[PDB]
């Protein structure tokens, strides 16, 4: 694929000394650069990875895609309450295949609705088609045939072959309603576009267009007898078998009763018609030289013989080859292929193309796959999964995840993790450790986010990511709501300071009970010793209990020392007296600042009061 | 997403993203550091600061772990390399947002890059120059980011003649958490791995046969989910080279060749990595970028080509 | 963990297994003599436990024995199972010369026990002194 | 959907924001009255024509203006008196009381409070004394004041990305500020030529901090991107009578609600504004319909009937 | 007989929220017994997970933490409801078999013990009432009961109340075929209920009154309930097949009773004639033997169809004639 880098400004020209283009990946798949090491060439180009899919339409897509996915419980999984588990595990999975087939339709629509370009829509569509034929093929009777079950497999099928392709349009109904030089309806076009909707199962479209020139005109007049056929042969249109196979026995009984009884009978109209109406009677009867005959493409000869000759896929390799041969393989849409490789049972090698189409459908794709046992890991076999080791299905959405993760999209990401240790096989060790290396990407902005990201990590065990991320949190009210050990002393340090100087936060220490509960630690514990040795201060024994907290907390820990001082100082027994000798025994730039700020030498001082202090106790 | 003006007078020599992609490290010969800012409201790119950092061409920056502040470093042709942190206190534009918190002159000779190592190794760092020896440092205690020490010289060419203005060196550290330390180094036409020995010293575990010129870039990739490393070069003989490198003449280190390609006709210079080493890119003379993933056999082919 | 998590902690394991001396207790155990003094010990004559105190040291001595059989016999199959290869694997491997004290022939710890028929007699013999943990 | 008649004229509704992580859908409203000598700011439960329950009230002097949660707990109103006043919830004994007030919020004499929005701890108002607002929980003056900001009536106010603000004036203004700015004068100017038709409504976009809506004197809605010129990039016609207010669905804003004057509230759905199938959903008998509040499936307006509407089931 | 109550609700339990974990099932964890362990440790890989995401891990722990504690609660009392339930089950069997060897094993008079007998009607009334389509363990116990219980049968009061009950129990099996509920086993015993009650009691102005309000109920369901039936013949079981097969014949003959039929009517919409006459080919390979008595009770229901006036027309348009030539049987 080639794209072109920026459609505006192109940094090159002629092949004027082949300039050195240099290019980096950016963390965001929206979001890379371009650039160029020459003169006069100082541009920046922000350039995004080609076809990458940042729309809102495509993550719900995604999310819905993994709810199939994440719903499907053990059953995304395939065992190589007895005979039943068999049967159940296809129902279940059948019925997935059908949830991923809506929430393609759903995306594509909002695709069709909200858009700049519609070339999307038309690829989705297309994977829609190629997978309805899938489950039509392998997604209803489960290997048996379509006496198992006629209702659903017939519904599918007339769902799926009318909404591959959009025609009979309104838009060509009218075109022949329209167009002369033929009295009335009865040219080839006519008949050829009421056969056409028989063979699509478009029945009641197919009665409108009779009832709508000749039924009771030309016919009810010219001849009674065509008449009675073409009125009761509407009429078993009208009642065609869609639950019973038994019914339909009955019913291609009444048809080819009909078709024999017109068949040899009286011809009071034009030599044309004639034929016009047995052709119509032979095509609802079944014949394949006729089903044939007025087929435009192979899917609509293939649809016929399901519905008018056998009900049966025992056929469908006759029944394909015979409509190939009246109509081969349109390559100009990319589904036809893909639905005659699927009904001629090679059903593999469809995975890299599709994930060439869109990388998500391809990862469930194979998921579903992998689930009803179409595919398998064959491999046999050093320590992880992102390989061939596993499934080829495991490996797509593995790389779906990893994907995921550079889109930046914090929607998708528990999708991606989600997805990671869903994941089938791989050990949980295996998984700890991928998820070990992705987590620490996810765009976290809310609480919430890094809320779900811790949860992640105590869900898988990851401390040392849990303890990393919160370090980048880390880096004055951002600090108190910090409150390794070496940041811890410096806060330490910084409270012990703030309080030599000398407010909820303070109290809570000594909304406000959920905080109380939040935080029901040295550091802490010495700050909220401080205020309340400060509190004290502000309510004599009481404060003879304050000083010698404070001598206490100093033998713990020079700045503090020298604030003690100066506290000791403003203040002017035996026990008193043995903390100021511990004091003097344990007795720098910034030190004498906070001297002369308190001044506003210092050894002298604090020898002169401790003098002054002993004579006190002397006195006593 | 239209192109902008770097606001360099002399020619850009490398561009580089923070770890959230949102932000991105400008330096080029002006002697001048640039920072873009991606504004979250109306999305384009916009200048957070400018300024003049060396006395020479600075070749080489990168970003340091988010868990250790906003840390930048420079290389340049003066023979240094700077740190610098952001000071959120100042006003964007003013030239004064990030203060030098250091400088190491032990080089001798210029220097062609510089490169930090993985979080999970603390605050650390390698560069190499014309003198050809490989200097990794370390700041020992996180709390001072100005404490940086010099924790190992390596003499990774031997010979380097007095009379050649055609040199080129590359660094890339492995960004895998779950392996032994170790980084690739690319000189002239060689290409040397080194792994921390037992002995906390590095040791030569490996090299990267086949270049037949100038690497002019090299990358190690991001190895979360695989047990092997790969490691890509584009080289002046216009070859992108993918190495798959498996721990199991004195290694412990297998190389296997998995790719080459010449889909560039003339010399790729650039060579870059996804964030999850899913997608690997190249770019080169014929003004074209090229975006490559793995088969499933573990080949590589082109997705898409930008020009 | 070698299946699963990683191959760090499995060096822990290792150490663990092959430095506790539970497998040489264990190897012992297969012993003839341990068992034979064993039985000898629990096999006293019944004046003695009756005229005895509940405090008396042959009461302990008993109680232990069967606390120590009981443990053997609940830990055979755990060690045997993931025990005695890995130490084979490592004495292969490594160098160590250690003597074997075991009998190849008792394959189980009842091998060496099922040769003793007053032991069952004994026991229910014991069950008239009224020790309750005895009994 | 259902109407209760409360025996007041509703100037104002208001969901009560859902615990963090809730799994239910809104069930607790509050409402204001106006144009009554006593005046309430009253909460109401629907419980499981509906079941309501006034859980409490309180009298509030002057009409209600505007009306916002804040928190859980707390309710912001703006009086015709120009007092903002801070409501706090008690619910274990189903009361409210008044937790903090600024009675000198907008005053020329008295000039009505015309407009509240919050981002807690932020709250910033507007009125027609042209002032501007912000307020910070527990902090007795303004963090600022814009003195003097507009010369004409300033009828609305939303955050775009705080401290960045949008207002909306009586001559068709959305005007841009920032309290840390410098002077009395907006950063942005944004109009439609010819009518000056006054905005009386505004709500900023969920997801695209850039893009607002607003409502006007003529009835019509507005589509802005304040980074695409000065003209709206859509203008579309809607009710006969003015449009009172405008809001963005939450959690899915190609839905999109407006009431008016006229008697109707339309449910708009575009499922991008930049880059549309309308529903009526009050009956053809209906007086203004002055305030809606939406959240999730749950919708709730009040009427100069003395009417509530509610539905809990818009889209089922 | 006091084990027997629904007031309990040992079935329902309380959900709680669960805003987070909700994805955590017990896979792994299940004899239904679901270990502990197995939700253990998956819940606290998820935990490292989001710890390791560092988005707000601090607060959101204690949430997880009380979510664990109520989920291990949960798994206990799950386990709990199983064993008590399990339980209950043994206890009704048991008590099931006692009953049912006393009743046969019984030489006294009957007259005395028919008071027991309606006292053990009224008593199984409410439980079969509870448990009429629940669950289909404890009716199969209470089902055959009554079968056999109908089969082994002043005055004039004794006679009332068994009269209204047998049609109160008449309603309850009606309704549970309509819906297909249970399996093919007990789906049987409810044919020979209805079968001997159409038969013996409704079969003078006390036998109009009965009549008529019978032809009621079965018009309630309509073609709900004849289909179920219809689908129960020609199937995998035997027993049920055969019950199914001699139910309608029940049916239409008391329906004639009360020219034509509606019974007979629905049976030709449902399809019903026309597979059944597809079926008499190849007879002969059909024909003590189980399979013996089962093609009985189907040409004997043919015979019925051919006695009404309005059945010669449904009949004759199955080309009856053609289908038993290819049989070869004559």
Redesign the interface.
């Known amino acids: 694929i080639l794209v072109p880098m920026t459609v505006n400004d192109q940094p090159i020209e002629k092949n004027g000394d082949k300039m050195p283009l240099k290019f980096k990946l950016g963390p965001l798949s929206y979001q890379n650069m371009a650039f160029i090491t020459a003169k006069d060439k100082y541009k920046l180009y922000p350039v995004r990875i080609p076809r990458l899919d940042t729309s809102k339409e495509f993550s719900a897509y995604v999310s819905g895609l993994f709810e199939i996915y994440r719903d499907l419980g053990d059953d995304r999984v395939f065992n190589v309450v007895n005979s039943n588990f068999a049967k159940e595990h296809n129902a279940t999975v059948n019925l997935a295949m059908e949830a991923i087939l809506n929430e393609l339709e759903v995306f594509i629509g909002?695709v069709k609705?909200?858009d700049g370009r519609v070339n999307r829509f038309y690829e989705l569509e297309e994977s829609l088609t190629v997978l309805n034929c899938l489950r039509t093929m392998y997604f209803i009777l489960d290997g048996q045939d379509v006496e198992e079950n006629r209702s659903e497999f017939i519904e599918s099928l007339l769902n799926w072959i009318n909404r591959s392709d959009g025609e009979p349009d309104e838009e060509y109904i009218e075109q022949v309603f329209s167009v002369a030089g033929k009295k009335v309806f009865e040219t080839q076009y006519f008949w050829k576009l009421l056969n056409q909707l028989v063979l699509r199962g478009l029945l009641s479209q197919a009665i409108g267009c009779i009832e709508r020139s000749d039924l009771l005109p030309y016919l009810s007049d010219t001849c009674a007898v065509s008449f009675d056929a073409v009125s009761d042969s509407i009429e078993l249109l009208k009642q065609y078998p869609k639950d019973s196979s038994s019914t339909f026995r009955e019913w291609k009984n009444l048809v080819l009763k009909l078709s024999q009884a017109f068949g040899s009978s009286a011809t009071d109209i034009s030599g044309e018609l004639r034929d016009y109406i047995e052709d119509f009677l032979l095509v609802i009867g079944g014949n394949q030289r006729k089903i044939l005959q007025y087929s435009r493409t192979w899917y609509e000869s293939f649809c016929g013989f399901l519905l008018y000759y056998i009900p049966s896929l025992e056929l469908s390799a006759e029944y394909l080859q015979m409509s190939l041969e009246a109509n081969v393989v349109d390559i100009t849409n990319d589904w036809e292929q893909p639905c005659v490789d699927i009904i001629s049972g090679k059903i593999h090698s469809i995975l890299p193309v599709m994930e060439s189409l869109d990388s998500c459908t391809a990862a469930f794709t194979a998921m579903i796959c992998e689930a009803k046992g179409l595919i398998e890991n064959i491999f046999e076999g050093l320590e992880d999964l992102f390989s061939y080791r596993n499934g080829m299905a495991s490996y797509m959405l593995n790389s779906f995840a990893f994907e995921l993760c550079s889109l930046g999209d914090k929607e998708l990401w528990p999708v991606a993790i989600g997805l990671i240790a869903l994941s089938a096989t791989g050990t949980r060790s295996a998984k700890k450790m991928v998820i070990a290396e992705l987590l620490p990407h996810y765009p976290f902005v809310t609480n919430?986010d890094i809320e779900w990201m811790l949860s992640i990590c105590v869900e898988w065990r990851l401390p040392e990511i849990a303890k990393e991320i919160y370090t980048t949190l880390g880096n004055i009210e951002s600090i108190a709501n910090f409150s390794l050990v070496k940041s811890y002393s410096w806060l330490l340090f910084e409270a012990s300071c703030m309080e030599g100087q000398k407010v909820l936060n303070a109290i809570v220490s000594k909304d406000d009970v959920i905080i109380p509960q939040d935080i029901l630690v040295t550091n802490s514990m010495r700050q909220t010793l401080a205020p309340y040795a400060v509190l004290s201060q502000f309510y004599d024994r009481e404060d003879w209990g304050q000083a010698l907290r404070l001598l206490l907390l100093l033998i713990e820990f020079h700045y503090l020392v020298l604030l003690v001082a100066k506290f000791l100082y403003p203040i002017f027994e035996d026990s008193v007296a043995t903390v100021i000798e511990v004091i003097e025994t344990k007795w720098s730039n910034l030190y004498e600042t906070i001297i002369e700020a308190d001044k506003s030498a210092t050894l002298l001082k604090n020898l002169r009061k401790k003098l002054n202090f002993k004579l006190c106790q002397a006195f006593m | 997403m239209q192109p902008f003006d770097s606001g360099h007078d002399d020619l850009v020599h490398d561009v580089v993203y923070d770890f959230y992609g949102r932000h991105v490290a400008t330096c080029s010969s002006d002697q001048h550091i640039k920072v873009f800012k991606l504004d979250?409201?109306?999305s384009n790119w916009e200048l957070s600061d400018s300024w003049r950092a060396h006395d020479s061409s600075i070749v080489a920056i990168d970003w340091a772990s988010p868990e250790y502040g906003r840390i930048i470093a420079s290389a340049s042709y003066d023979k240094t390399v700077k740190l610098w942190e952001e000071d959120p206190d100042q006003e964007e534009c003013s030239g004064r947002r990030w203060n030098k918190l250091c400088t190491l002159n032990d080089s001798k000779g210029s220097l062609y890059s510089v490169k930090f190592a993985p979080a999970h190794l603390g605050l650390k760092l390698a560069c190499l120059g014309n003198d050809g020896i490989l200097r990794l440092y370390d700041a020992l205690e996180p709390s001072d980011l100005r404490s940086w020490t010099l924790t190992s010289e390596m003499k990774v060419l031997s010979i380097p003649p007095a009379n050649h203005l055609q040199s080129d060196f590359c660094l890339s550290w492995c960004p895998s958490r779950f392996s032994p330390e170790k980084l690739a180094v690319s000189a002239l036409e060689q290409a040397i791995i080194y792994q921390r020995g037992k002995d906390g010293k590095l040791h030569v575990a490996a090299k990267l046969p086949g270049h037949k010129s100038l690497i002019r870039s090299i990358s190690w990739a991001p190895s979360i989910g695989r047990w092997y490393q790969l490691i890509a070069t584009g080289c002046k003989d216009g070859r992108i080279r993918i190495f798959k490198i498996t721990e199991k003449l004195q290694s412990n280190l297998q190389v296997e060749l998995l790719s080459e390609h010449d889909d560039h006709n003339g010399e790729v210079w650039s060579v870059s990595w996804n964030l999850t080493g899913t997608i690997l890119s190249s770019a080169g003379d014929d003004g074209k970028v090229r975006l490559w993933k793995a088969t499933y056999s573990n080949e590589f082919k082109c997705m898409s080509v930008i020009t | 963990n070698i299946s699963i998590d990683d191959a760090m902690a499995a060096t822990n394991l290792a150490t663990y297994v092959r430095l506790h001396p539970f497998s040489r207790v264990m190897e012992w155990l297969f012993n003839e003599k341990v068992i034979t003094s064993l039985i000898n010990t629990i096999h006293q004559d019944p004046i003695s436990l009756g005229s005895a105190s509940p405090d008396s040291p042959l009461v302990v001595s008993i109680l232990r024995a069967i606390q120590v059989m009981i443990k053997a016999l609940e830990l055979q199959e755990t060690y045997l199972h993931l025990v005695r290869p890995e130490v084979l694997r490592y004495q292969g491997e490594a160098g160590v010369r250690r003597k074997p004290v075991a009998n190849a022939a008792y394959s189980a710890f009842e091998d060496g026990i099922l040769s003793h028929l007053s032991l069952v007699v004994d026991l229910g013999k014991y069950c008239n002194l009224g020790h309750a943990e005895l009994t | 959907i259902y109407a209760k008649f409360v025996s007041q004229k509703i100037s104002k509704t208001r969901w009560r924001p859902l615990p963090?992580?809730?799994?239910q859908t809104a069930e607790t409203f509050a409402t204001g009255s106006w144009d009554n000598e006593e005046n309430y700011i009253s909460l109401w439960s629907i419980g499981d024509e509906g079941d309501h329950q006034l859980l409490c009230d309180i009298r509030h002097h002057g009409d209600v203006m505007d009306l916002q949660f804040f928190d859980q707990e707390r309710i912001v109103a703006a009086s015709s008196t120009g007092c903002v006043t801070v409501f706090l919830h008690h619910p274990n004994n189903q009361t409210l009381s008044v937790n903090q007030q600024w009675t000198t919020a907008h005053y020329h004499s008295s000039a009505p409070c015309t407009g509240v929005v919050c981002n807690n701890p932020e709250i910033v108002t507007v009125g027609e004394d042209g002032r501007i607002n912000l307020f910070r929980a527990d902090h007795k003056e303004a963090v600022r004041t814009i003195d003097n900001a507009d010369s004409s009536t300033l009828h609305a106010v939303t955050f775009?990305?705080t401290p960045e603000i949008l207002t909306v004036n009586s001559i068709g203004q959305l005007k841009i500020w920032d309290f840390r700015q410098q002077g009395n004068e907006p950063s942005q100017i944004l109009s439609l030529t010819g009518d000056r038709v006054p905005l009386h409504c505004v709500d900023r976009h969920p997801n695209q901090?850039?893009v607002v809506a607003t409502g006007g004197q003529d009835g019509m809605l507005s589509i802005w991107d304040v980074?695409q010129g000065t003209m709206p990039v859509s203008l579309l016609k809607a009710h006969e009578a003015e449009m009172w207010e405008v809001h963005f669905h939450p959690s899915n804003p190609e839905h999109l609600f407006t009431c008016s004057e006229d008697g109707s509230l339309w449910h708009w759905d575009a499922?991008?504004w930049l880059s549309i199938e309308i529903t009526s959903l009050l009956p053809s008998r209906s007086l203004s319909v002055n305030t809606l509040d939406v959240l999730g499936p749950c919708l709730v307006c009040g009427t100069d009937a003395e009417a509530i509407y509610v539905t809990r089931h818009l889209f089922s | 007989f006091d084990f027997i109550n629904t007031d309990y609700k040992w079935e329902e339990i309380p959900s709680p929220?669960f805003?987070?974990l909700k994805d955590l099932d017990l896979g792994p964890c299940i004899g239904v017994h679901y270990d502990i362990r197995k939700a253990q440790e998956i819940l606290a890989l998820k935990r490292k997970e989001y710890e390791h995401s560092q988005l707000a891990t601090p607060e959101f722990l204690e949430?997880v933490e009380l979510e664990e504690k109520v989920l291990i609660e949960w798994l206990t009392v799950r386990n709990r409801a199983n064993l008590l339930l399990t339980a209950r089950l043994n206890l009704l069997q048991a008590w099931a078999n006692l009953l049912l060897v006393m009743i046969e094993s019984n030489d006294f008079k009957s007259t005395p013990k028919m008071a027991f007998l309606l006292q053990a009607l009224q008593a199984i009334l409410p439980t079969l009432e509870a448990f009429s389509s629940l669950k289909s363990d404890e009716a199969f116990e209470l089902a055959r009961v009554a079968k056999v219980l109908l089969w082994k049968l002043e005055q004039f009061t004794v006679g009332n109340l068994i009269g209204d009950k047998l049609f109160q129990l008449f309603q309850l099996c009606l309704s549970a075929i309509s819906q297909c509920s249970g399996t093919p086993e007990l789906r049987s015993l409810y044919y020979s209920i209805c079968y001997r009650y159409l038969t013996a009691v409704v079969d003078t102005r006390s036998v109009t009154n009965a009549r008529a309000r019978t032809l009621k109920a079965i018009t309630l369901y309509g073609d709900r309930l004849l289909n179920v039936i219809c689908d129960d013949a020609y199937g995998s079981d035997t027993t049920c097949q055969t019950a199914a097969m001699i139910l309608l014949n029940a049916l239409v003959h008391t329906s004639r009773a009360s020219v034509d039929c509606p019974i007979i009517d629905a049976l030709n919409r449902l399809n019903f004639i026309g597979v059944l006459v597809d079926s008499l080919k190849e007879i002969l390979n059909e024909w003590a033997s189980p399979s013996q008595q089962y093609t009985s009770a189907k040409l004997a229901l043919l015979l019925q169809l051919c006695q009404t006036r309005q059945g010669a027309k449904y009949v004759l348009q199955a080309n009856l004639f053609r289908a038993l030539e290819q049989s070869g049987v004559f």
């Open positions: 909002r609705d909200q919430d | 979250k409201d109306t | 963090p992580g809730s799994l775009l990305r901090q850039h980074r499922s991008s | 929220h805003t987070y949430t």
